[PDB]
Design a protein around this ligand. Structure first.
Ligand code: HEM
Ligand code: HEM
Ligand SMILES: Cc1ccnc(CCCCCO[C@H]2CNC[C@H]2Cc2cc(C)cc(N)n2)c1
Ligand SMILES: Cc1ccnc(CCCCCO[C@H]2CNC[C@H]2Cc2cc(C)cc(N)n2)c1
Ligand SMILES: C[C@H](O)[C@H](O)[C@H]1CNC2=NC(N)=NC(=O)C2=N1
Ligand SMILES: C[C@H](O)[C@H](O)[C@H]1CNC2=NC(N)=NC(=O)C2=N1
Ligand SMILES: [Zn+2]
Lengths: 405, 404
């Protein structure tokens, strides 16, 4: 065997070796003494140039002009520009390539079979919070496409020396309010308590429902963030019903169609895009298992079990598992009926297996975070449970970044 | 740096300082994480410090850390190693080390029970025949007519000179898997290779789906010997469903006693190549993995059809629904048979309590998240939401090469 990690699939009995991991330039949180792979948050001058050069080489490889005159001219360009200004700027096609590659590189995304199919909106001309809003609105209109969802990213101006960042304060473009009660409970999404109160502090008149869509708090360089309300016609939502349990519709549950992450930093060739929201479509377990059944999210498991007349007084009745299955089915059924793209965890994980094969041949490996890739219900019923995975950081990358406040 | 470890459901944070006590490297590096891999990627002074550190662990455990008994025991160990290149454990040290190895086992969600472990000293064992007698005693004791009791039997340690004592079977109870001349399997596909080894060392096979394998037991540098387990010693549970009448008709069953018999127990640098241990099942091992793994009994489709589910399409969640009913049937059937089993909610709730116990007791607990989180309903259990640190402490249970 080679001195690259051996990766086994225990269902099929097949073996690969990950050589791509050698391309990692960035350390994760593990050491030989202890593994820290389960942590959610594993917390320039010449440094910039080498990252730039590496990225420029990656671009030229992908267009098969590596070593070419154009490749060598671009490198000189980059270093000349960095030499006189301290930074440099990407060509358009380099940005598109870098954005797809960041997605391709994202170890926590099971959706990566789709990585080559990404609409990249270039918004590097944006000069105000108002224009960020127009751009985001367009993104949302394009991406939503009346239920026939399309993966997209909008990229706003890069971080600059001593000038303020573009930031979207919201963690997603669509978030339901979380209202802290006098009794200490939360109405709405407890995930969004903090962003909800920031919105109120910045002048938003709050509602009082379980599903109030929040305004966007948008920040242009060195300015207070500005508040913007999404026209409700832009925000496609799906009311939830169950295919045979008629009373499920009476619960008044719903979810929005477009999962759009807005708090991550896109890093390309050492350049930092602090606002670069991206969207795809949901895997149904995200809604039906996590968002709805997490004890610290909507926490509806008991309510549903009571309605199904399950024995919630003992763990061994498996009342949680039964209720969770029906909530997931309701989500799938309801998105289907509504004609809103969604993928269940079996279809998603099967397609991620194909992705791993594609990447083994294309690049000799695929960075993957097992804990995230394996769905939160029915784990070993999906092929990825049985697949060993190697996790490592490649660039271009999406990274977590601190909250702006 | 000592890792900060967060629980995301409750927002609580701890610090793991137990990991500093690790002496053995796992497979990860700063460049890449290998925590999802099933198998680990890969002189007298070295034995002496392992031995001394384990002796220190032992006298600390009984509060006699610094006593005459302690100092004199270190001299004994040192004298023995320097003269002979090895040493031996007192029975009480063996009992302390076996519990500690369980306690330290990162893949075990049942560690709340770690202090309750019956240790059989089988170190005065000199033949395969004698191993069989000890194993029969273990099974009878651990089984206890359905009221299962955790146990370990410890056979003689490895010695520089000779071959190891080994039990060839991966468990004391295993169902045969018979390969057909078209590659396909009848019985348990996990056991194809052990089944052939049995037939080949002379066993007369059955042709059923749940034929209990005999044991291949090996004394040092001898051919292994075959021993049929007496039927009455192997308690099995027929599987039925509380509401689905047809479920029984599937003819499914599972055995009561989970006893791992291929792992090595390392205490104080000494190695016990045969030290089978048993507890009781968590229902998902049977209901989810053993029965629904595509490379195991793979029954999901059969049950789905019987439930008249829409099998034409994944998005009806037919797999999820059949798996739930199968786990329910295991739980129901074990309860009906009065055989100890724990469901995955109750087990993971106990493990959270264990974490807290261990944080106070030791300042950490090594845990392999991928193993601890159950194979159905992961995020429905608290352990999903709990960050974990994985690392190797000694005493340990380890994997070892297969004897053939
Ligand atoms: C095409 C439809 C897509 C599906 C079904 C999909 C699926 C998923 C799922 C299930 C997660 C885990 C989310 C969670 O547990 O909260 C995830 C995370 C991730 N996805 Fe994908 N994805 C898709 C498109 C995309 C696109 C277009 C990008 C970027 C261009 C992307 C990059 C990521 C990143 C960076 C994470 C980690 C987010 C974090 O750590 O907060 N995904 N995706
Ligand atoms: C008290 C009842 C017990 C319960 C409910 C329990 C639970 C579990 C579960 C669910 C697993 C993972 C099994 C799998 O996925 O196949 C496991 C693995 C393990 N358990 Fe426990 N356990 C118990 C007793 C014990 C005892 C008595 C020991 C040792 C004395 C032990 C040491 C281990 C070890 C070493 C592994 C890893 C096995 C391997 O890697 O193949 N367990 N146990
Ligand atoms: C593109 C796409 C497709 C499908 N689903 C999505 C939604 C992804 C939401 C991920 C949010 O993750 C949050 C909530 N749970 C762990 C935590 C991890 C995290 C932490 C931080 C500081 C930022 C961030 N983006 N993600 C996005
Ligand atoms: C004490 C107890 C309590 C509850 N369950 C059990 C049974 C545990 C059986 C674990 C067997 O694991 C096998 C089959 N699947 C992954 C694989 C890991 C492994 C590999 C090797 C070479 C040896 C070994 N013991 N374990 C034992
Ligand atoms: C502690 C643990 O890492 C967290 O609960 C992780 C586990 N796996 C996960 N997987 C995915 N896809 N999303 C998560 O939010 C998530 N949470
Ligand atoms: C590849 C991955 O590590 C294996 O499939 C793991 C995942 N988690 C697991 N968890 C448990 N408890 N037993 C397993 O056999 C198991 N298999
Ligand atoms: Zn790791």
């Amino acid at each position: 065997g080679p001195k690259f990690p051996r990766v086994k699939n225990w269902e099929l009995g097949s073996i690969t070796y990950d050589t791509l991991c050698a391309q990692s330039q960035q350390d994760g949180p593990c050491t030989p003494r202890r593994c820290l792979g389960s942590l959610v948050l594993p917390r320039p001058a010449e440094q910039l140039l080498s990252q730039a050069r590496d990225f420029i080489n990656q671009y030229y490889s992908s267009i098969k002009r590596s070593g070419s005159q154009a490749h060598e001219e671009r490198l000189q360009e980059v270093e000349a520009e960095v030499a006189s200004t301290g930074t440099y700027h990407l060509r358009e096609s380099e940005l598109v390539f870098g954005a797809k590659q960041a997605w391709r590189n994202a170890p926590r995304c099971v959706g990566r079979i789709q990585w080559g199919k990404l609409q990249v909106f270039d918004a590097r001309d944006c000069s105000s919070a108002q224009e960020m809003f127009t751009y985001i609105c367009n993104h949302i209109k394009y991406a939503t496409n009346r239920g026939n969802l399309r993966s997209a990213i909008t990229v706003f101006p890069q971080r600059a020396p001593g000038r303020g960042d573009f930031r979207i304060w919201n963690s997603q473009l669509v978030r339901y309010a979380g209202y802290r009660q006098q009794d200490g409970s939360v109405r709405g999404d407890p995930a969004n308590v903090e962003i909800t109160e920031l919105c109120i502090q910045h002048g938003w008149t709050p509602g009082n429902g379980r599903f109030d869509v929040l305004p966007l708090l948008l920040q242009a360089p060195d300015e207070a963030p500005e508040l913007f309300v999404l026209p409700p016609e832009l925000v496609l939502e799906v009311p939830l019903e169950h295919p045979t349990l008629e009373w499920f519709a009476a619960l008044g549950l719903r979810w929005y169609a477009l999962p759009a992450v807005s708090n991550m930093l896109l890093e390309i060739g050492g350049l930092e895009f602090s606002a670069a929201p991206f969207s795809g479509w949901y895997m149904s377990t995200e809604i039906g298992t996590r968002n709805l059944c997490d004890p610290h999210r909507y926490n509806i498991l008991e309510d549903v079990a009571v309605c199904m007349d399950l024995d919630t007084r003992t763990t061994s009745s498996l009342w949680k598992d039964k209720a969770a299955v029906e909530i997931n089915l309701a989500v799938l059924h309801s998105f289907q009926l509504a004609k809103v793209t969604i993928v269940d965890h079996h279809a998603a994980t099967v397609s991620f297996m194909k992705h791993l094969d594609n990447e083994q041949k294309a690049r000799g490996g695929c960075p993957a975070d097992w804990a995230w890739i394996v769905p939160p219900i029915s784990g070993s019923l999906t092929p990825v449970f049985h697949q060993e995975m190697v996790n490592y950081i490649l660039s271009p990358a999406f990274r977590y970044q601190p909250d702006p406040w």
